[model samples]
Target: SKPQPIAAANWSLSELIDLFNSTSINHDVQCVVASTFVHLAMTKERLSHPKFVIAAQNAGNADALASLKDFGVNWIVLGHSERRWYYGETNEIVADKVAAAVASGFMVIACIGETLQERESGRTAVVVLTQIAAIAKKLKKADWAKVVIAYEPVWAIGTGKVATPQQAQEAHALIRSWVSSKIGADVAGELRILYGGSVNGKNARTLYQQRDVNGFLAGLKPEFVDIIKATQ
Candidate 1:
């Protein structure tokens, strides 16, 4: 079955709270709020809509998983580009964390992307596929049911640069094709590949029209309401 459209909002606690309180997310999109550890509990409590759920931006260890579970956070975003570059999280580390998070019964939004250098050099497929392979190597078939992949080009993230609809579609097709080949056709068919990095209301509809772009992981702001509606 094709996955439903999901709109995930990753932002500061105050911003998320304000967005949630101020806007009425009446669309049918599956909404997720990714927050820092310090804000998960409050974020979870503040989620008034049934479709809205909470996610941890990153989870490092068993303790982190325990804390996340305690706070009712059902999803965890792993291997975000910032975590990879700033915190030195390698592909193996990210895969290990994904495995750990899944073992602890949490859904995972695993991120993979290419840097500006890698993209400019035409290594986007290699870099992103290799990152996915690492996580694939660690998970069994069943674990994939709980995983969603987010493709966020490093250069586009927070850079006010969005991938053209065609560019985003190409990367997503590449990913789905790779997953179908390496993982299994069934897994690939059911996989939800989300586009991140500079995703906003204006670009949301076109991006969602891409055959393989199942949804989005975007920064939370007032325009987020428009983004969610765009999916509808």
Candidate 2:
């Protein structure tokens, strides 16, 4: 038996929810780098209907707390290159921020990359690994599930210089090997390392398809995500 549906002049949020959940690729989606009540309102339908997510961009202590409290945000981005170069925050601050976010019940994404100088110096491994050690200390078996790592070489970020798929795979694999040596093989196996720095739509899948590089955090330009297909 079924009851007749009531006619409404407008589409309710619930109706919107039904439509999204029915058609979306995944029921769970998130609106990221978001802020404000208005933004929340605008995104709430997306959040509720498709069961997506939302994140706050350029947020700090106060914003992080507000985001967690107001919108159930559980992830935060820290140590973006812009913050590192423009603000002079070193690896130490990035380590501290990792602790801060974990303490506050939010997971942190630590972005580490080689500047052109560091990369061209042939010291990318020495430099990036040193910074990675700082993060490895703050992580534990429990924290393993929450933390994310993004590797972006300064030479590549926003400069339109994309790494070849082979190069990106090599770098990510080296990082995982480093993690294993410093932390442990098991811990290294659990971490998710994202490839950034000049990543665009034309080459996303190949990088993601690599064994070590698990996912991505792409630049703002409208690049596609079928990176694996590019190589295929």
Candidate 3:
């Protein structure tokens, strides 16, 4: 994440909130300003804007997640590739975590995607499907109401290699199809599946234009400010 010191992160967040505050609360601009668990209260306390909310980067377990909700966090980011890769969390484990989070009434950003090797070996869809399948086993049809899928190809996450719009659309479309087939067309249609691989201001519009790509999971950069502007 942020290579900067804690003070720098705080300054950046403050600037973002001011930028967010100055901008018109139009139909387009929205964000989930996030920070570490310790800084989460600060983010929530400072933001008095609509269309913006605080989010936790990760929830270690059901109890920890429930405690965050008690602490006023309504959203949680789960299944990030970093969590999977760095922490050795498997799909099944992520699925279980998702189920626990949802059960506790938190809106979840459930991430799924393929690694570079898996993509190159032509198993992108297979891998993504398997991941979703594990989640499907844990979540009931009703629980999906609070779930939003974030597709972040492990290969593209921070490697400066972003997927083309077509490539992203193809995968997003497949994800929707998988959900539609297993979950239901209505649920799939209503679900927001976001792209999350090196998204920045310059490329956000193109990515957002894709059929199944609803939005993004972007890094916090000044470019991110431009991205919110680009959407409208």
Q: Estimate each model's TM-score.
A: 0.94, 0.75, 0.90
What ranking emerges by lDDT with the best candidate at the front? 1, 3, 2
Tens digits of lDDT, candidate 3, 113-219: 99999999999999999998999999999988888888989998878889999999999999999999999988888788888887776787788777787777767
Kindly provide the TM-score of model 1 when superposed on the true structure, using C-alpha atoms.
Answer: 0.94
- Estimate, for each residue in 1-232, the C-alpha lDDT of model 2 and write its tens digit: 1111110000054444444445434212122233344454554545453223444443556555655646666666677787788888888878777777776777566778888888777998888888888877776757756676777787877798877777777788888899778777776776767777766555665565566666565542223223212222
TM-score of 2: 0.75
Better of 1 and 2 by lDDT: 1
Model 1 lDDT, residue 169, Cα: 92
Alpha-carbon runs more than 4 Å astray in model 1: 12-27
Best by lDDT: 1
For residues 60-172, could you state the per-residue lDDT of candidate 1 as single tens digits? 77987987787677888889888998999999999999999999889899999999999999999999999999999999988999999999999999999999999899999
